[PDB]
Short mmCIF file of C-alpha atoms and ligand atoms in Angstrom, two decimals:
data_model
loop_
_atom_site.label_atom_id
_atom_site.label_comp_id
_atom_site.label_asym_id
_atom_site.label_seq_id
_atom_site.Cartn_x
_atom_site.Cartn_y
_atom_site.Cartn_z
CA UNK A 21 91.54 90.90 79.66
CA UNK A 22 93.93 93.84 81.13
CA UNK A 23 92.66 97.34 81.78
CA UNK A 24 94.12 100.17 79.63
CA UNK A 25 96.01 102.89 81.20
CA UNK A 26 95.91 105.84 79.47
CA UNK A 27 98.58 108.60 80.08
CA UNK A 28 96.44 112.20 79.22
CA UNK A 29 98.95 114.88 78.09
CA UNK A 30 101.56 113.65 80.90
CA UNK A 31 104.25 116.39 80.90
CA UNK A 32 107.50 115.41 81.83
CA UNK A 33 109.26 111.56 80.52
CA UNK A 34 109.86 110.85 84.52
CA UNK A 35 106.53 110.63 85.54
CA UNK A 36 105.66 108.15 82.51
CA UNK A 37 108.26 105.87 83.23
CA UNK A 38 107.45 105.73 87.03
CA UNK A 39 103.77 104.82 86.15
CA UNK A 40 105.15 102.13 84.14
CA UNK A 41 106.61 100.78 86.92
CA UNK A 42 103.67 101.44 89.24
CA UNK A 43 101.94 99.48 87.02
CA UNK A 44 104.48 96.37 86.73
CA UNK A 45 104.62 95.73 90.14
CA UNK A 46 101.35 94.54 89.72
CA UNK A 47 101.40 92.80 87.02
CA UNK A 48 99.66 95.49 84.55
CA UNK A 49 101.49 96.41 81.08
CA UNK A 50 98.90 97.84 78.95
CA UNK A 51 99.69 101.56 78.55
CA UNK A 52 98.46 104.29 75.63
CA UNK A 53 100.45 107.99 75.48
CA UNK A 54 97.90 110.96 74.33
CA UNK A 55 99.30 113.85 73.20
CA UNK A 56 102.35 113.95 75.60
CA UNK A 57 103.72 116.99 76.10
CA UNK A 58 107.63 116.75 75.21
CA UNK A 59 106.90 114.13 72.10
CA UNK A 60 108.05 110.12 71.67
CA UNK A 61 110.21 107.98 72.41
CA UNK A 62 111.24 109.89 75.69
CA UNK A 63 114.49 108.67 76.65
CA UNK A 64 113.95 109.89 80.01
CA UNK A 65 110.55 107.87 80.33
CA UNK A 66 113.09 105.08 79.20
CA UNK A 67 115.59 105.78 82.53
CA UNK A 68 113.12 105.81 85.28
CA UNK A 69 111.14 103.20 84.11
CA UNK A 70 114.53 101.23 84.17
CA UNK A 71 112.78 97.08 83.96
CA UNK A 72 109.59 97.89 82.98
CA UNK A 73 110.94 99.76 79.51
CA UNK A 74 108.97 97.37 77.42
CA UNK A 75 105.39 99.04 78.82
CA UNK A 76 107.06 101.47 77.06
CA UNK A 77 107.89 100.63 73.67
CA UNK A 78 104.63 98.88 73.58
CA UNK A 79 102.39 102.06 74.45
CA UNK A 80 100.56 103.20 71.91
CA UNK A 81 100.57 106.97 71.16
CA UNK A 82 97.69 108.41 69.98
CA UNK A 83 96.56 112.36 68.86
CA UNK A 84 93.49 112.56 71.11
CA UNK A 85 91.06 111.29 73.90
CA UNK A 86 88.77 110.26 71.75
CA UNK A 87 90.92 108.58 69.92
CA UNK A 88 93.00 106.64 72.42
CA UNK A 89 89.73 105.09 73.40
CA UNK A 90 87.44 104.13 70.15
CA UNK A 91 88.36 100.75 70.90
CA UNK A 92 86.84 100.42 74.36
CA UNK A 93 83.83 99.59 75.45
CA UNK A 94 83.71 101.53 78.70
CA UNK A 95 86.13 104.27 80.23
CA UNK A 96 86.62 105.34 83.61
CA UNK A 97 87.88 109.35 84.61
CA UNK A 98 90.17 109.29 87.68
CA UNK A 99 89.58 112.93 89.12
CA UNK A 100 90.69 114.33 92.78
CA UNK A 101 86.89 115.04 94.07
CA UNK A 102 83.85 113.69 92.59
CA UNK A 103 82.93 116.58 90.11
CA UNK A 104 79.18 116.99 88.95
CA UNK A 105 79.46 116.43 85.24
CA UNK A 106 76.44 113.93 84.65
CA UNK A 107 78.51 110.81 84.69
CA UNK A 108 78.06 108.13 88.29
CA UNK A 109 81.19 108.55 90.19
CA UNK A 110 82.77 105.31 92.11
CA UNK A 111 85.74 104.67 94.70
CA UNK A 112 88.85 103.03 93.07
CA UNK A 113 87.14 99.55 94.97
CA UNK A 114 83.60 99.81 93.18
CA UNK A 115 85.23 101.36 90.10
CA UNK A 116 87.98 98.48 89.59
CA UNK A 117 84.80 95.23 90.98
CA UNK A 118 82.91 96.72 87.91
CA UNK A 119 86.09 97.06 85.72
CA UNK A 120 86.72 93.40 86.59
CA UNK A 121 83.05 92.40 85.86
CA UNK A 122 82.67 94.12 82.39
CA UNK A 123 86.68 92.28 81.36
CA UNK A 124 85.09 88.68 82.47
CA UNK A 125 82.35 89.57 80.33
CA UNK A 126 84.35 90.29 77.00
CA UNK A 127 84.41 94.09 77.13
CA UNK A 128 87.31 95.95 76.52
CA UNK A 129 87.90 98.71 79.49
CA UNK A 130 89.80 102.09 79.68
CA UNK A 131 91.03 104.56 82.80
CA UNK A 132 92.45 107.92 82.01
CA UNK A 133 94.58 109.69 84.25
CA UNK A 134 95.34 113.26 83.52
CA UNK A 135 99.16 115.54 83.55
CA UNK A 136 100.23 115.78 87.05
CA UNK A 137 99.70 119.72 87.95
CA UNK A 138 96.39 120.23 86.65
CA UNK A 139 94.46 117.01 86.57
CA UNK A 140 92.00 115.44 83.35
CA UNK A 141 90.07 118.57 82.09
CA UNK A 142 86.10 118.81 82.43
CA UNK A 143 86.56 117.62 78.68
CA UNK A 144 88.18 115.05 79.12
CA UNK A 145 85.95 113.78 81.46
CA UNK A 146 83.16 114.38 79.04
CA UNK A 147 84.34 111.17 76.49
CA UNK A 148 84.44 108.80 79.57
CA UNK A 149 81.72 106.64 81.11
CA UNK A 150 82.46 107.00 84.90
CA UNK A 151 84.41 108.64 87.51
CA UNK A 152 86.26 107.18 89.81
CA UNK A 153 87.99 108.99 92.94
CA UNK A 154 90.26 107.80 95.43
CA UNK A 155 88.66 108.79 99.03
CA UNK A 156 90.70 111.70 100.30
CA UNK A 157 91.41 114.03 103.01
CA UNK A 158 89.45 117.08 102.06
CA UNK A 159 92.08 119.34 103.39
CA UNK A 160 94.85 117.82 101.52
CA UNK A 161 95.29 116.05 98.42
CA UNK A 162 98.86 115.18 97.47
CA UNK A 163 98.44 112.04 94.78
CA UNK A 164 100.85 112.34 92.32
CA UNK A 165 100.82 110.74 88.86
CA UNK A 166 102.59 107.47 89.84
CA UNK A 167 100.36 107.12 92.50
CA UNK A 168 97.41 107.27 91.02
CA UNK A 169 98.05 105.17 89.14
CA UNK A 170 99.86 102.31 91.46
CA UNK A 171 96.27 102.75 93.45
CA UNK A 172 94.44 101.82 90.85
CA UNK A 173 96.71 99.15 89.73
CA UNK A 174 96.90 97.86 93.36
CA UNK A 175 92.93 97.91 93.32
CA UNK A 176 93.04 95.88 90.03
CA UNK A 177 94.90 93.25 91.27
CA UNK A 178 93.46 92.91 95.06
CA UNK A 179 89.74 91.22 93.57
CA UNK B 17 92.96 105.06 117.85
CA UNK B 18 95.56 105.42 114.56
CA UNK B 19 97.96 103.26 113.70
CA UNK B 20 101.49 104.72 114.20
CA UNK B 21 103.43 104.64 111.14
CA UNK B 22 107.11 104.01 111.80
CA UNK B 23 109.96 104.86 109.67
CA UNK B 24 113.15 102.73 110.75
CA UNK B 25 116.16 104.63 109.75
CA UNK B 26 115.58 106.11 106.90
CA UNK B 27 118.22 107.55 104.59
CA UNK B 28 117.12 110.73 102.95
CA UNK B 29 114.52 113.70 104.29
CA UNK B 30 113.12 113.56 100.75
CA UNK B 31 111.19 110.52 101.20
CA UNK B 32 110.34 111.12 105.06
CA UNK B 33 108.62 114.04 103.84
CA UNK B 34 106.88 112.30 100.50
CA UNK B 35 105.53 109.54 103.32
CA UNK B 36 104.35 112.33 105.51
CA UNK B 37 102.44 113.68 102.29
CA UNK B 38 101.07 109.96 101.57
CA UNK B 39 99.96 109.70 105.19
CA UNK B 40 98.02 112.73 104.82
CA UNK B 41 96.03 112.14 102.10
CA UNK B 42 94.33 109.64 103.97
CA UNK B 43 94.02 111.50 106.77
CA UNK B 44 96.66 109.86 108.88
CA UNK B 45 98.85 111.60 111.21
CA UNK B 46 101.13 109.58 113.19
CA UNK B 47 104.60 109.20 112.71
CA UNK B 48 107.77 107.74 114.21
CA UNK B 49 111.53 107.92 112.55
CA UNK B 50 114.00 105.87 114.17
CA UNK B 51 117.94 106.69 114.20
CA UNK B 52 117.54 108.10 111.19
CA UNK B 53 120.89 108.48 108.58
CA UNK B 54 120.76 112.72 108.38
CA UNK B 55 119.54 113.49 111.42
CA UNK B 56 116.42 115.56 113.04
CA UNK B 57 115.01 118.12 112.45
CA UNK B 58 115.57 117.40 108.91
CA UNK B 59 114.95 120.52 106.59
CA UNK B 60 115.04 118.22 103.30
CA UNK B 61 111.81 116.43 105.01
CA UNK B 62 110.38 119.83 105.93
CA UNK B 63 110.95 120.63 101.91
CA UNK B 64 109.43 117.93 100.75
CA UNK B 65 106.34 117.15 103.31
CA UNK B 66 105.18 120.88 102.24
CA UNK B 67 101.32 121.09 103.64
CA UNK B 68 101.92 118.07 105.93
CA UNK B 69 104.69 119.42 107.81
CA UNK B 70 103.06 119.40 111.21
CA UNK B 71 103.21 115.19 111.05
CA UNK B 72 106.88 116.18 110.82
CA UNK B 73 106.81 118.39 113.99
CA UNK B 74 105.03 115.67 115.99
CA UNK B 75 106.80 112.98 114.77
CA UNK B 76 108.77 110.88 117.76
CA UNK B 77 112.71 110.73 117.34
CA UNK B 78 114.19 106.95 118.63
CA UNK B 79 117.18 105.76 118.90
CA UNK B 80 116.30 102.02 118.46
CA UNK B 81 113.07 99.72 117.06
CA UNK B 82 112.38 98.18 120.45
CA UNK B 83 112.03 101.91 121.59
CA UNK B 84 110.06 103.36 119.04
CA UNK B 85 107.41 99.93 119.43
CA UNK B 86 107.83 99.50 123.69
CA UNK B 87 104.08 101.09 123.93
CA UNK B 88 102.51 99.13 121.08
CA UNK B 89 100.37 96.29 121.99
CA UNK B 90 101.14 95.17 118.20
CA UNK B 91 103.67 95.66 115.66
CA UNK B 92 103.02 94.81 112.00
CA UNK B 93 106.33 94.49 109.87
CA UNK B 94 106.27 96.08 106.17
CA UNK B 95 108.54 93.41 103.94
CA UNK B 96 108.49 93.07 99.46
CA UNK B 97 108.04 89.16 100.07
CA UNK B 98 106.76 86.78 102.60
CA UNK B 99 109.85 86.37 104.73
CA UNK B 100 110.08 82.61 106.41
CA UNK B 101 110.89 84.25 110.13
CA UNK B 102 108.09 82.52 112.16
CA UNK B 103 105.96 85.66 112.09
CA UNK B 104 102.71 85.48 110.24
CA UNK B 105 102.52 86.94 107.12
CA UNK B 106 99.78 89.00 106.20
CA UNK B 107 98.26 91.24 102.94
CA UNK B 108 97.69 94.77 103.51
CA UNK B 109 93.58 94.03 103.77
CA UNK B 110 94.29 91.48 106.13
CA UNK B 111 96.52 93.24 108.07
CA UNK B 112 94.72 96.43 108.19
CA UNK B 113 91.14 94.78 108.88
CA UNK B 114 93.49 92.76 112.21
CA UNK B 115 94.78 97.02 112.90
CA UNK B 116 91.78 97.93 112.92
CA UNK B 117 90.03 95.54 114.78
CA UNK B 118 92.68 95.95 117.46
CA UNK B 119 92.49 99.80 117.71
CA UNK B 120 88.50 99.35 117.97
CA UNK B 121 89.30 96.76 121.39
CA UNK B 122 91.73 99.70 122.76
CA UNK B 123 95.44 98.36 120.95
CA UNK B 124 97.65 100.48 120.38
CA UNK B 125 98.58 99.44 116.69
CA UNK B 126 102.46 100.02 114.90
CA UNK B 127 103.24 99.76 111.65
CA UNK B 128 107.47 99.44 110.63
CA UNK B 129 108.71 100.67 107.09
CA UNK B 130 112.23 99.70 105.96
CA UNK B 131 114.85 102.32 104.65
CA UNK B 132 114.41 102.38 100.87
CA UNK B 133 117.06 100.74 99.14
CA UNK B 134 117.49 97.45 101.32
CA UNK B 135 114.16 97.17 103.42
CA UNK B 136 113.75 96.08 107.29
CA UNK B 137 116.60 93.90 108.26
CA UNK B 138 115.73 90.19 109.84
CA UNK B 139 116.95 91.66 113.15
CA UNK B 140 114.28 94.54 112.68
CA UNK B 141 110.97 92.03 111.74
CA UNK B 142 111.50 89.46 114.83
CA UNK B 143 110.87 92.54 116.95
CA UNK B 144 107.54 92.44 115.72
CA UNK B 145 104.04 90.51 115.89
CA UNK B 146 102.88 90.18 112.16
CA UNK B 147 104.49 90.88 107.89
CA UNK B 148 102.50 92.71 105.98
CA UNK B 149 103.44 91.88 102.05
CA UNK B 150 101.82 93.87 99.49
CA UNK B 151 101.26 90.74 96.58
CA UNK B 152 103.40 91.94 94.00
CA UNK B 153 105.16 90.77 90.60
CA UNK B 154 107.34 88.00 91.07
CA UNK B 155 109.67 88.87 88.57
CA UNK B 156 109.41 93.05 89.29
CA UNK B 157 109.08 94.74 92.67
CA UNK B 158 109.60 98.52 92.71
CA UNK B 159 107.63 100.34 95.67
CA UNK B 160 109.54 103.06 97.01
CA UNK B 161 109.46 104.30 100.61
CA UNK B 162 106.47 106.58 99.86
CA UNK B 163 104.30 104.00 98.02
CA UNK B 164 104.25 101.76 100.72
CA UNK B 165 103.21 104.28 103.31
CA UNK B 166 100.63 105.25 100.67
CA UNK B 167 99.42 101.92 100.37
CA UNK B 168 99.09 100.75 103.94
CA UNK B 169 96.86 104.43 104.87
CA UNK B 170 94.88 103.85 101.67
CA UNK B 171 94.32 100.50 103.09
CA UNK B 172 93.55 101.80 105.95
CA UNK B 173 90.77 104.32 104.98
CA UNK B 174 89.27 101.75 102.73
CA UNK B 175 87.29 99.83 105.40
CL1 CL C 26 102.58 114.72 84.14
CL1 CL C 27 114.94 105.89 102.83
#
């Protein structure tokens, strides 16, 4: 029914919890950890998500990509620019009207969003089924982690 | 041509420069801050707005709303809920499509953004023509400053 959100080697416990909360405000609580850099529980995670908290001690953590998504039937990528790595490559709109499509249908559906500095790798990208890339200023791209994903939550819950 | 993004007196240079950032992402560059609490220039916003600095540099200084909105044709009021103060109340698609529609016919389009730990006051919304209300959570509402700028220009540049 609800999207996954999955958190790719996020690095520090602040920018967790304010995803959380990105993804409260509309509605969304279904979060997976991979790999996270400073280990879990994060009691700082904990403070700055403040009321959403309980995305929090419901995420599941999980050792790998592949992992954190064996139980989905399709995965989207959320990169800065639409790299050339084989897979179609959607706006958060088309991404999110397909995502919506393939839930109504039955099918389970994942996004991964990568640590904050550096981005998903090219290997990461690999174990997904689609891109999807927010339409951006080619001279400047500033989207932190938090609002990635609060776009992408926001696009989820527009229809 | 752009819709003027208006920041009514906002409280710390941090978040004038994370909404410059936001802004710029989409390719926006149009700001206004009005009385704001630390003053102007602000080098706390300069910090923060990094890269987008020069929406800093052009940004109008006013000493009241009705100034900062006198050469607007229309004035669209940023509020967490749908306020009962005999404006219309709008979504952000709605209310961007209206902007844009408006700027296409020649209007010369405002947009007001509330300080970030109490929002526009009553007194601040009846100075203008239309809410905009991003549909949130009932029970949970936590946009900062920065996400709502960020939402409103991603509306924007959606289309
Ligand atoms: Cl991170
Ligand atoms: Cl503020």
């Amino acid at each position: 029914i609800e999207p996954v959100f999955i958190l790719v080697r996020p690095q520090m416990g602040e920018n967790i919890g304010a995803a959380a909360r990105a993804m409260l405000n509309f509605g969304l609580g279904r979060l997976r950890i991979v790999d996270p850099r400073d280990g879990w529980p994060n009691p700082k995670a904990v403070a700055m998500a403040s009321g959403a908290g309980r995305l929090l001690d419901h995420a599941g953590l999980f050792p790998t990509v592949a992992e954190a998504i064996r139980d989905c039937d399709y995965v989207f990528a959320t990169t800065a620019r639409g790299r050339e790595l084989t897979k179609p490559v959607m706006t958060p709109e088309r991404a999110m009207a397909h995502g919506r499509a393939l839930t109504g249908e039955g099918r389970r559906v994942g996004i991964l969003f990568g640590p904050e500095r550096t981005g998903l790798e090219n290997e990461d990208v690999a174990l997904a089924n689609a891109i999807v890339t927010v339409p951006v200023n080619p001279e400047f791209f500033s989207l932190n982690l938090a609002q990635c994903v609060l776009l992408l939550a926001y696009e989820w819950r527009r229809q």
